[PDB]
Design a protein that fits this description.
- Chain B: This is DNA-directed RNA polymerase subunit beta'.
- Chain B: DNA-dependent RNA polymerase catalyzes the transcription of DNA into RNA using the four ribonucleoside triphosphates as substrates.
- The structure holds two protein chains of two kinds.
- Chain A is an alpha+beta fold.
- Chain A has a single domain (about 1-73), classed as Double Stranded RNA Binding Domain (2-Layer Sandwich), CATH 3.30.160.560.
- Helix content of chain A is about 25%, strand content about 25%.
- In chain A, a hairpin with a 4-residue loop joins strand 1 and strand 2 (about 20-25).
- Chain A starts with 12 loop residues before the first strand and ends in an 11-residue tail after the last helix.
- Chain B has one helix at about 5-10.
- The N and C termini of chain B lie far apart (about 15 Å).
- Chain B is built from one helix and no strands.
- By secondary structure, chain B is mainly alpha-helical.
- The interface of A and B includes residues 14, 15, 41 and 67 of A.
Chain lengths: ~70, ~10
């Protein structure tokens, strides 16, 4: 059981690693579920890549804010 | 798996 929750600051973004593979869900301002994309963390390696890879694709679908407010630069 | 959305907000 892997549930989706708003990605930290992203007003309408969801990200949960469905098992060993990753599942992304993006909503609209009206909260309409737009996109559900799948990733795999096995290719990446670690937890940060898990979140950081999700944000990359999802942002252009309506994900705008921050997942880890620590200024990753 | 144990990570999920919980990893994002951290």
């Amino acid at each position: 059981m892997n549930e989706f929750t708003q990605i930290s600051g992203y007003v309408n973004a969801f990200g949960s690693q469905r098992g060993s593979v990753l599942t992304v869900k993006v909503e609209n301002d009206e909260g309409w579920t737009l996109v559900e994309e799948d990733f795999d963390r096995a290719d990446y390696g670690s937890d940060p890549e898990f979140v950081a890879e999700v944000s990359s694709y999802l942002k252009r679908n309506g994900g705008i804010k921050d997942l880890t407010k620590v200024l990753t630069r | 798996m144990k990570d999920l959305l919980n990893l994002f907000n951290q």
